[PDB]
């Protein structure tokens, strides 16, 4: 399967380098603009602002790993050592699963605000959104911890080893973990946003739009960008239970920067919370 090995090498060296390189540029400029916009324009934060700022911190953590990941794919090996293997493996999964959760909680916030514009409920308080943001970081850190435990069992002390559980280690345990993480990390938050879009549609039909716009964009972005990656991570593991295996790995490589395109485009959500932040950004410039 020398032909498929040539494809794997080219995909890593050229496709991943270029795609992550573009995400690094677009993501850094977009995230630093919205972060500085909040640091200099927003004086009294609500729940949605808290979640959006956390989303940018998650995106920025991921964007900071890209020079290391691009250099590793461009050169064909991991050379950064054990500490940076664990920290990068953490950040990549953490960014993926905190991002959809912050958008899920923003969606619930937009629904509660549609029913209770004056934010009288405890669930609508700024301090409660801070508590939920901290819960999101803790939950996601815990979802990612079995992968880190597995990595610490591999010979990372060698300095040039940083394995992917999708490609290495017991396929039976990697599949159970990958499928549970697909369910809890992806399908469940997506389903919750779908449920709250439906609750929003029903509320507005009774009372007879912007709240619908944010949630619809979130459902579309995550359905389109996360689905190929979650299918291929699971298919990559299942195939390990030949040329077919290398061909599946090539499909899997293709899906990875597509899921992380989310971190470069999700600063758009700052402009969908009805505060005219875009207009506020221009006033300061």
């Amino acid at each position, epitope marked *: 399967c020398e032909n498929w090995l040539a494809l794997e090498n080219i995909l890593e060296k050229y496709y991943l380098s270029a795609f992550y390189g573009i995400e690094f540029i677009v993501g850094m400029l977009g995230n630093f603009t919205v972060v500085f916009g909040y640091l200099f324009c927003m*004086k*009294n*934060w*609500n729940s949605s602002n808290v979640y959006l700022f956390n989303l940018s911190i998650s995106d920025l953590a991921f964007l900071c790993t890209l020079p290391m990941l691009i250099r590793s794919y461009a050169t064909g090996n991991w050379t950064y050592g054990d500490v940076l293997c664990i920290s990068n493996r953490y950040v990549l999964h953490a960014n993926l699963y905190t991002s959809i959760l912050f958008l899920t909680f923003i969606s619930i916030d937009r629904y509660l*605000l549609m029913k*209770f*514009p*004056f*934010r*009288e409920h405890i669930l609508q308080k700024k301090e409660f959104a801070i508590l939920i943001s901290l819960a999101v970081w803790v939950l996601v850190t815990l979802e990612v911890l079995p992968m880190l435990t597995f990595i610490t069992s591999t010979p990372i002390e060698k300095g040039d080893s940083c394995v992917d559980y999708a490609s290495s280690g017991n396929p039976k345990y990697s599949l159970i973990y990958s499928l549970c993480l697909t369910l809890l990390g992806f399908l469940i938050p997506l389903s919750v946003m779908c449920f709250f879009y439906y609750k929003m549609v029903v509320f507005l039909k009774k009372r007879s739009n*912007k709240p619908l716009r944010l949630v619809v964009l979130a459902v579309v972005i995550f359905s389109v960008l996360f689905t190929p990656y979650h299918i291929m991570r699971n298919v990559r593991i299942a195939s390990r239970l030949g040329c077919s295996q290398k061909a599946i790995n090539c499909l899997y490589i293709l899906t990875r920067p597509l899921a992380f395109l989310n971190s470069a485009v999700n600063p758009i959500f700052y402009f969908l919370v*009805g*505060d*005219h932040f875009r*207009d*506020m950004l221009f006033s300061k410039l």
Partner: nanobody
Amino acid sequence: EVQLVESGGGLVQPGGSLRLSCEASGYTLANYAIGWFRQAPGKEREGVSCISSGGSTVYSESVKDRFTISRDNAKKIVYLQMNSLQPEDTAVYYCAADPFGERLCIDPNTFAGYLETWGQGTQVTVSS
């Protein structure tokens, strides 16, 4: 460019009614959202009612079955009809104007923070 003055503040017996007015001075009020807020001594400011430039109205849960917000763009006035007032409604009532007419009423307690146009406030006292 608008200036606001609230009026109608007074003494009400519990269960009594009172109408406040928020009058504007400037070119036009048409494109403005107008929100009514109140602050009791030692308490935080809280929104009570808001009217968008399109005429949509929103009410806080504590005043929903009792207050009515309305506007007359020709007289450039916004009224707050307050019925069944209780001692807990004692506060200085203020009106605020948002030039983004469809913005304020989405999230009045948060979006009030972005506004530069406020009235001086009018005292409403509910005591037996």
